[PDB]
């Protein structure tokens, strides 16, 4: 104990140390009029309570909570019926520390880790995913409803509002690729045999996604990249080496929009939030490259690689063709504020499904990897810190949530979705 609480007075709170720490951190308070009295004295750092273990009128010592980012130490001390007589918060605020970690978010298996159910339901009890294809949030949902295709498997549905993840029925054999046009419409290629039958199909927005379209014919299409400015809709196919598009306000086809060096493979195709340019991810060659868009003629120009080495798998992290990527599949593009007011504000996040990772590639053409290979092994299902402990098996998807700040992984082996959010 210490000084009783003068109510005359204000709660000065002068410092506190450590100056920064992580949650659990037992961190003392320094200052004047906290009183004498544990129960009657209430701290928040960030807006969150922090358990109060002692109070000696010029000191008081608690506990660090989890989510303090805001720093702010602010002290109070209440009557004897709970209301608040004073409180008074430190100009400095309290630097909290935290690593990022891997988590599971959706999917339940059951017979260590061997078996589990196929079915819509709650995100508490909704079984586990046979395929995490490719995700997507819808850009009209402000994060609250995120898609994924399943190929052959589920096509599934994440609502955020009702906590519920459902199977849509979407009467395609082959889902290979899922994004939206500029008027919020959901576009699905179908990777299909036959030159004569839809390969980009559209479910319309003002039916809630639920009456179908037909765009265009296409074998073996594999992915939909909708131009930011201009809305056309970029995809390949198996037997072609070129990027091709429909343009969905007009009805236009453009077989060539530029040759391709490859063909035969799985490609996926990202639009550069500016839509200066996209990159084409060789899932099957390992290897990242870039196609320029000429605004003034609406053209593409010869891609070129930026990274990996076409054909030669790998898990070297370094600076372009000196980098190796193994079976990159999808990937996004998420703002770096240490980029701020650069000509590239982005980094490009992607999961490189047989390395078990999801690496970054830098506007310098640097890879590094984000996630995976934890423990000194290559695959597995562990949660924890980035890369000490996480393990991934067949990290194929990937999705970033601005709203609530964190990655959403589609862990295809683990038949599950996984997070990378600030420990919590
Ligand atoms: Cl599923
Ligand atoms: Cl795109
Ligand atoms: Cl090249
Ligand atoms: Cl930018």
Request: no cysteine.
């Given at each position: 104990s210490g000084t009783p609480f003068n109510p005359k007075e204000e709660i000065v709170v002068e410092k506190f140390l450590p100056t920064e720490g992580r949650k659990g951190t037992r961190v003392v308070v320094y200052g004047r009029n906290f009183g004498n009295d544990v129960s009657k004295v209430k701290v928040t750092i960030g807006g969150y309570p922090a358990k109060v273990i002692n109070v000696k009128g010029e000191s008081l010592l608690c506990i660090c909570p989890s989510k303090?980012?805001?720093?702010d130490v602010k002290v109070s001390v209440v009557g004897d019926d709970e209301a608040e007589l004073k409180s008074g918060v430190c100009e400095a605020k309290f630097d909290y520390q935290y690593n990022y970690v891997v988590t599971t978010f959706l999917g339940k298996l059951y017979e260590n880790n061997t078996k589990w159910d196929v079915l819509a339901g709650p995100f508490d009890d909704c079984g586990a995913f046979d395929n995490i294809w490719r995700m997507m949030f819808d850009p009209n949902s402000n994060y609250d409803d995120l898609y994924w295709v399943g190929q052959r498997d589920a096509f599934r549905h994440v609502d955020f509002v009702n906590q519920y993840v459902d199977i849509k029925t979407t009467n395609i054999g082959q889902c290979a690729d899922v994004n939206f046009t500029l008027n919020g419409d959901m576009v699905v290629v179908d990777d299909q045999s036959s030159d004569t039958n839809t390969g980009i199909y559209l479910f319309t927005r003002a039916s809630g996604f639920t009456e179908r379209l037909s765009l265009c014919n296409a074998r073996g299409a594999k992915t939909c990249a909708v131009h930011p400015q201009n809305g056309k809709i970029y995809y390949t196919r198996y037997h072609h080496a070129m990027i091709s598009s429909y343009d969905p306000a007009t009805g236009t086809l453009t077989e060539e929009e530029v040759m391709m060096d490859t063909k035969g493979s799985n490609f996926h195709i990202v639009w550069h939030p500016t839509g200066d340019w996209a990159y084409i991810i060789y899932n099957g060659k390992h290897c990242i490259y870039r196609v320029d868009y000429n605004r003034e003629t609406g053209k593409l120009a010869v891609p070129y690689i930026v990274c990996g080495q076409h054909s030669s798998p790998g898990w070297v992290d370094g600076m372009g063709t000196g980098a190796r990527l193994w079976g990159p599949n999808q990937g996004i593009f998420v703002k770096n504020e240490?980029?701020?007011?650069?000509?590239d504000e982005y980094d490009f996040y992607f999961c490189d499904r047989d390395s078990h990772t999801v690496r970054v590639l830098t506007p310098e053409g640097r890879v590094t990897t984000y996630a995976g290979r934890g423990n000194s092994r290559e695959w597995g299902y562990v949660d924890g810190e980035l890369r000490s402990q996480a393990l991934f098996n067949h990290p194929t998807s990937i999705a970033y949530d601005m709203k609530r700040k964190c990655f959403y992984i589609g862990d295809c082996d683990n038949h599950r979705v996984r997070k990378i959010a600030p420990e919590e």
């Open positions: 303090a980012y805001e720093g240490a980029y701020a007011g650069e000509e």
